Amino acid sequence: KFNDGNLNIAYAKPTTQSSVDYNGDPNRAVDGNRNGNFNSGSVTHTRADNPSWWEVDLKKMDKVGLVKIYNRTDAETQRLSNFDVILYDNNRNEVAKKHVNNLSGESVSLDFKEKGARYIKVKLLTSGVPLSLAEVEVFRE
Numbered sequence: 670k671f672n673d674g675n676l677n678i679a680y681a682k683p684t685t686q687s688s689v690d691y692n693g694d695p696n697r698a699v700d701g702n703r704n705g706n707f708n709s710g711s712v713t714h715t716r717a718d719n720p721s722w723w724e725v726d727l728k729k730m731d732k733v734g735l736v737k738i739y740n741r742t743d744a745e746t747q748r749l750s751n752f753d754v755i756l757y758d759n760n761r762n763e764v765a766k767k768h769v770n771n772l773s774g775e776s777v778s779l780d781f782k783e784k785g786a787r788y789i790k791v792k793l794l795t796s797g798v799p800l801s802l803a804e805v806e807v808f809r810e
């Protein structure tokens with residue numbers, strides 16, 4: 670629930686994703702565990718979807734600052750590439766979007782500067798690539 674003294678508002682929130690494979694249910698990206706080894710149980714996994722995506726629902730409009738996305742680490746790390754992070758309001762209107770080409774480390778940090786949003790979606794832009802996320806943390810600043 671807190672990471673380095675900052676309240677992670679995504680923790681334990683409802684999640685969905687495009688499909689599930691390998692029992693990589695979407696709630697694994699909000700289970701409080703940054704472990705990126707798939708075999709740990711901490712990491713989501715969709716099927717090879719058109720495209721694969723994952724989303725957290727904050728349950729109401731909230732304010733979104735830092736969003737930190739933790740990649741799978743044990744294998745297939747390149748899958749988390751060429752992707753959008755999209756904020757939606759209560760009526761699923763897009764209110765902000767950032768594109769990430771790839772990760773040089775195990776995570777990427779994005780600052781949405783306190784934009785009002787209820788949903789944060791991670792969407793791969795390449796057809797037929799599974800989406801796996803170790804953790805998605807969201808902070809209000």
Ligand SMILES: C[C@@H]1O[C@H](O)[C@@H](O)[C@H](O)[C@@H]1O
Nearest residue numbers: 691707714743744745799
């Ligand atoms: C859980 C599995 O891990 C393996 O390393 C991959 O080759 C499979 O595609 C799948 O992601």
Ligand SMILES: [Ca+2]
Nearest residue numbers: 697702711803
């Ligand atoms: Ca996790």
